[PDB]
Amino acid sequence: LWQYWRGLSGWNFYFLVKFGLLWAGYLNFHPLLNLVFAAFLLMPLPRYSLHRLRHWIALPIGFALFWHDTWLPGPESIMSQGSQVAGFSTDYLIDLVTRFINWQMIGAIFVLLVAWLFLSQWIRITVFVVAILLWLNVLTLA
Amino acid sequence: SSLWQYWRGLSGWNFYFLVKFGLLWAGYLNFHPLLNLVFAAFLLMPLPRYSLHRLRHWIALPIGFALFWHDTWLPGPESIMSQGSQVAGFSTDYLIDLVTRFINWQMIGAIFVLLVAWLFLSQWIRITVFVVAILLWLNVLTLA
Amino acid sequence: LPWFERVWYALANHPILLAVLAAISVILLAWVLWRLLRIISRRRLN
Amino acid sequence: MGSILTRWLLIPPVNARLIGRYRDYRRHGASAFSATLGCFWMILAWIFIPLEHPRWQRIRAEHKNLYPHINASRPRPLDPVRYLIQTCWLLIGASRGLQNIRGRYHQWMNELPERVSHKTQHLDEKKELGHLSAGARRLILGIIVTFSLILALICVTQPFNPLAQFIFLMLLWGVALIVRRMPGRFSALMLIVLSLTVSCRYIWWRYTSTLNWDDPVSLVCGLILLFAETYAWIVLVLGYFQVVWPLNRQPVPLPKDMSLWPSVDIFVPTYNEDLNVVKNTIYASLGIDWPKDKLNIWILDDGGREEFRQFAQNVGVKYIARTTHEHAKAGNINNALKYAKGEFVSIFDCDHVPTRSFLQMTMGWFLKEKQLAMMQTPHHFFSPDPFERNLGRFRKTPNEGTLFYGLVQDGNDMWDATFFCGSCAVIRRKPLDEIGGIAVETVTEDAHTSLRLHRRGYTSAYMRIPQAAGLATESLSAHIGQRIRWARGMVQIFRLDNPLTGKGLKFAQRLCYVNAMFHFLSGIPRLIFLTAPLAFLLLHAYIIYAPALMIALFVLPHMIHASLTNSKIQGKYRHSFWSEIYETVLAWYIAPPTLVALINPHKGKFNVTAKGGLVEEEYVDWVISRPYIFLVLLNLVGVAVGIWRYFYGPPTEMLTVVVSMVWVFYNLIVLGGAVAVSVESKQVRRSHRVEMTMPAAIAREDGHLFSCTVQDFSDGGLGIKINGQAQILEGQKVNLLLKRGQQEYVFPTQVARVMGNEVGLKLMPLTTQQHIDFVQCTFARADTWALWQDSYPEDKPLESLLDILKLGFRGYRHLAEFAPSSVKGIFRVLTSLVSWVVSFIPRRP
């Protein structure tokens, strides 16, 4: 089964971003759910097809989980209030978007991406991600 | 195809950052640590294709300049354009006098010395490691 | 004061001026040296 | 850690791998503790580092190259730290339009000669106008002289604060670095004037501001150092004067009519040397390209040996012996001069093999210049000297004599001050008879004879083309014995026939002769510099009464400017810092005989130097190494007391302790180099091999001819490279064909070894004529020695400093190669620290 354990690949970056956001105070982090998700991603699958399937399944799940961890209104609230947003002029929407998007945060995420690309070659980032996840869970239980 | 053959040091941009650090140290620059880091990250990003490298340099030049201008207290291009019509009325002698007053020959000489130092040191040491370390350090100081 | 200490006092705070005067002195002593060595080689031809 | 515990905790495959590795570590000599720790770290590395990644695979594959100091098979507990340090080093200092800069730098480099050529055209072009009013011109060039000397005097005398002195130093150093990059003789003259200005500023500060008058012990030690520094400054000034404009004299063609060529007597003096040494010089002398009716060769046998008389008769050369062994070589030559009748005399030492071109390359100037009394050529040696041999540096670094013959004598010719060096010279008979022959009053008869010729107003020339080559001294003992004789003789001339006060010499000749005599007095100043920092450490004596920062701000400029100027002028003939090793080895041995000659010049016997011996085993000459070991031990006591003063001494003296300690460490590096030379290396071959590329052929007994290239030759045999598939067998008799001009000569040889296309030939017993022809086809060729001088790489002061630091450690390891005390036991401690030091200075990949 040793040969079938494949590190969190691109999902390492997903978690790093989450950690960064948690640290910045933008995320309500649910430690156990994220650990379960990580466990799901680390689970040893022998077949290449199962790996593809996992990636496909993991993408929506990861997104959902990320959203859940965010302070963002549920898709239901957006759908019910979305009809009010459709009446906003394009200029207002752009203004809202520019105010909402912190270009500094985007830049940080980018820097993190480059760092991750660079570090993933030297160090097993998965080990750290899992360690931090374990640690965060322990903190929530203590 | 290990993305690795494609990691190239900051080459000439090392000098750009060194100059910035020197100016920051002299108190002439309001250094925005995160934006400069992002720029550095952009420059270090691994690109496989030679064409993408050329493109990066082309893009980086205006960005680097813009960022350098931004980090300086210099009036925005808008202020210059709106007040520029008032500067067009200045006699050539006045403009030269203003320029001579504005340009500190000592600072130009320092930049030149820094350039020579960099060319000389770059033969022995990887300056990129230092530039990135200082950038990271400056960012940490702003967060602490 | 004298004249040798007045010159020293006037130049004491100007290390750049003395370095320029040293460079001028080196060029003048060398170049005349080149010419005169050529002249001594010519006296050798004599 | 076969411990029941790992068997219980780990699964069988993992356990098996760990045990296998552990055992592997134990097999290679790792302690149990180190092996366990190594396994642990490996596991950790596997956990955190993707060792499967192509990067780590490459690094692992190149592990031996990247981490030479770390043995993967023998883990040490501090290995991780060592890896970190090395990695940090590799990451940082480890590297060995912008691209256009490189090409354009070379473009300007190529332009340098082109622009220089244009400048020389302009040099003549400006001269094509350089004329006006001579009285005034003298005033104006003289006007330059007075104003520039006033500016130089202000630059020398100006008192500065530490900051102004630092700025002034950095600016003068910047000017020196710019000027050093400029090609040509003019930049060398600027560097001389700049070096002299800075060195005069140093000596001025020393005399005016740095003597403690209130402490008698500091005053006496400070005056002893000031004497050594004043001597070093005088030799620097006179050295620069002597080499300021090397003449590079070219040969003058002889008349086409050989009836106008003068008569020449060749003298080959021998005392006690073996006939096999003298044979080669005589056989080469018979091959000189001169009319046979105008060439006479003389064996001057001071031993009166019948084998030499019979040899002379068999070869058709003149023989003379004498019954009185008075004045050695000088007396032997002066006896021969009574019977010789040639208009010129040429002298070769009995081991110096002349080239056929020797008289053609030298004689043309004696016809051009009627007042020319002497022409000297270089002494070249085809065997290593003891420094070259014991350091393993033969033909890699210029040997001690290369500075003197390569530059100093060519500098002397500019001043009409070239002096006879005992061999490889032509002397006009009439001027030599007018002075009473070769001088006999001093043990350097050669230099003293030249002084007498110059006192009569005759001239001397130097031809810097090797036209003969001899044998070097075979031991450091014989070498030191020869240098003691020369040092004594030069100081005897300074006392008996003083160049400064005696009549007849031109002012420039006086300065050149004084510098040549002063050079041999260097032993006392060198011993002072090796002991000076110990005066403060051991006696608390302030040898330089100034703040340690001011000492650095005055000494460092002087040393840097002198070194940069010497590297630019001398760098082909002497590498930086190598002079200090040569002078330090000689210093102890030349100091007593020169001091005795200065007080009483008549106290001296001539010793003969042995040549032609074998060194069968490597040995340390403990009699010769004694002074170096004493100076090393004395400097190490200095280090121990300096460490004690740094921790228990006054805080105000801490910088003075550090400056004295840096000087003691420098002295220990130089003394380590002197110790490294004192280890005699094994001389396996009787016959020295002369590397030379020449076309040849080999004929087998079946008549098949094969083209070959001679790679090396010696008196007993040759190394050849065969061109093509020659089936040559070991022990086979083969005829070697060599060419001399249009004539081909056949030499019987036996194949001694075959290594693919490289064949070692041994000469069979030659007839007298074949032996003459062999020497004339090899040692006496016109091109043999001329090509060897231009082969030395240009000096790089920082690379030469590293070479000496390696040599000193090697010399430390040489005092460890042999020590009569724990000195070596210390080196045992020294090398544990230096395994740590292989970890330190990052190994250049």
Short mmCIF file of N, CA and C in Angstrom, two decimals, chain D residues 18 21-22 25 31-46 75-77 79-80:
data_model
loop_
_atom_site.label_atom_id
_atom_site.label_comp_id
_atom_site.label_asym_id
_atom_site.label_seq_id
_atom_site.Cartn_x
_atom_site.Cartn_y
_atom_site.Cartn_z
N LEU D 18 16.11 -1.04 8.13
CA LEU D 18 16.81 -0.25 9.13
C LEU D 18 18.02 -1.00 9.67
N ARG D 21 20.80 -1.17 7.12
CA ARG D 21 21.52 0.10 7.05
C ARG D 21 22.43 0.29 8.26
N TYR D 22 21.90 0.04 9.36
CA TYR D 22 22.69 0.10 10.59
C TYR D 22 23.94 -0.76 10.47
N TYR D 25 26.49 0.84 8.31
CA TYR D 25 27.21 1.90 9.00
C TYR D 25 28.29 1.33 9.91
N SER D 31 30.62 4.47 15.14
CA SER D 31 30.23 4.07 16.49
C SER D 31 28.75 3.73 16.56
N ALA D 32 28.36 2.89 17.52
CA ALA D 32 26.96 2.49 17.71
C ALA D 32 26.06 3.71 17.84
N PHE D 33 26.54 4.62 18.61
CA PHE D 33 25.77 5.84 18.83
C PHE D 33 25.59 6.61 17.52
N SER D 34 26.59 6.77 16.78
CA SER D 34 26.57 7.50 15.52
C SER D 34 25.72 6.78 14.48
N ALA D 35 25.78 5.56 14.45
CA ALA D 35 25.00 4.76 13.51
C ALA D 35 23.51 4.89 13.79
N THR D 36 23.14 4.84 15.09
CA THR D 36 21.74 4.99 15.47
C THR D 36 21.22 6.38 15.11
N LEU D 37 22.02 7.29 15.44
CA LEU D 37 21.65 8.67 15.13
C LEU D 37 21.53 8.86 13.62
N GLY D 38 22.42 8.30 12.86
CA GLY D 38 22.35 8.35 11.41
C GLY D 38 21.07 7.76 10.85
N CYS D 39 20.68 6.61 11.39
CA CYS D 39 19.42 6.00 10.99
C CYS D 39 18.24 6.91 11.33
N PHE D 40 18.28 7.45 12.47
CA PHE D 40 17.24 8.38 12.91
C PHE D 40 17.13 9.55 11.95
N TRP D 41 18.19 10.14 11.60
CA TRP D 41 18.20 11.29 10.71
C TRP D 41 17.71 10.90 9.31
N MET D 42 18.04 9.82 8.93
CA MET D 42 17.59 9.34 7.62
C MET D 42 16.07 9.21 7.59
N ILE D 43 15.62 8.65 8.66
CA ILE D 43 14.17 8.52 8.75
C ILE D 43 13.53 9.90 8.73
N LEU D 44 14.08 10.77 9.46
CA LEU D 44 13.58 12.14 9.49
C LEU D 44 13.65 12.78 8.11
N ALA D 45 14.72 12.57 7.45
CA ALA D 45 14.90 13.10 6.10
C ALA D 45 13.85 12.53 5.14
N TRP D 46 13.52 11.30 5.30
CA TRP D 46 12.54 10.66 4.44
C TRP D 46 11.14 11.21 4.70
N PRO D 75 28.40 8.01 9.40
CA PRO D 75 27.74 9.20 9.96
C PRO D 75 28.32 9.61 11.31
N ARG D 76 28.48 10.95 11.43
CA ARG D 76 28.88 11.58 12.69
C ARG D 76 27.73 12.40 13.27
N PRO D 77 27.57 12.41 14.61
CA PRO D 77 26.45 13.08 15.27
C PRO D 77 26.28 14.53 14.80
N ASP D 79 26.77 15.71 11.83
CA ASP D 79 26.67 15.72 10.37
C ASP D 79 25.57 16.66 9.90
N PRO D 80 24.45 16.71 10.61
CA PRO D 80 23.41 17.63 10.16
C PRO D 80 23.88 19.09 10.14
#
